[PDB]
């Protein structure tokens, strides 16, 4: 048994993620690695719940409601929707390769934001 | 154990790949960011092999072995080219066998995360490491 998140919570994980995107575009190391995880919790969702419960119209509008990080309170921002979304994994789903799959993921994109602080700090403005 | 991708990898080439796995294993098995990735990668091959090849063409004696298989700390840029081309040998083998899809696209980010980490170490030796 896979385990399973509230809609209420795939709804918040699915904002989290877009507004990653929005601030992330032009960072393909960050966006290419949120948009597994979006593709991946949209697939898990729809085995979540029956078609009773959450109608293909309702579904296909929850993950995917139908840009250069160069910041510090980008990066702070960021990791902060980063963590909101990994806590949640975390409470939600049991340990094991599936969920270890996104953690990874989200665990990368928590490198990238490192990395990018880093140089603002040393090569940008005080 | 059904969920894997739709291809299938070569038995000889399982064997090196899990070979490089547990080379990189053993040199960044304190680089945590590194080992977790491989780990992950190692295990996920570990389950998908046993699904392609039956226990006729790969007895359970012989499958236990084939991925499952010095300071253990990355602290030389002899250290990171080598991984770094390991990681390439192991990246360039998976989509030469496996299409790409949300299954072999969880290891090829793992796989991008470690040289993302072999990046950073690198940066570190070079500016605070020995000048000489
Ligand atoms: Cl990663």
């Given at each position: ?28 190391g ?16 729809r ?42 994994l ?28 880093k140089?603002?700090?040393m090569?940008?403005?005080?």
């Amino acid at each position: 048994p896979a385990g399973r998140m509230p809609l209420t919570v795939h709804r918040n994980v699915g904002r989290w993620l877009s507004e990653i995107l929005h601030a992330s575009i032009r960072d393909t190391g960050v966006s290419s690695r949120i948009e597994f995880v979006r593709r991946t919790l949209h697939g898990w969702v729809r085995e979540e719940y029956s078609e009773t419960e959450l109608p293909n119209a309702v579904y296909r509008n929850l993950y995917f409601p139908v840009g250069k990080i160069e910041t510090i309170s980008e990066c702070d921002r960021l990791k902060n929707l980063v963590r909101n979304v990994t806590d949640t994994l975390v409470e939600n789903y049991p340990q094991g390769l599936e969920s270890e799959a996104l953690l990874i993921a989200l665990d990368g994109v928590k490198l990238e934001l490192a990395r990018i602080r880093k140089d603002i700090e040393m090569y940008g403005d005080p």
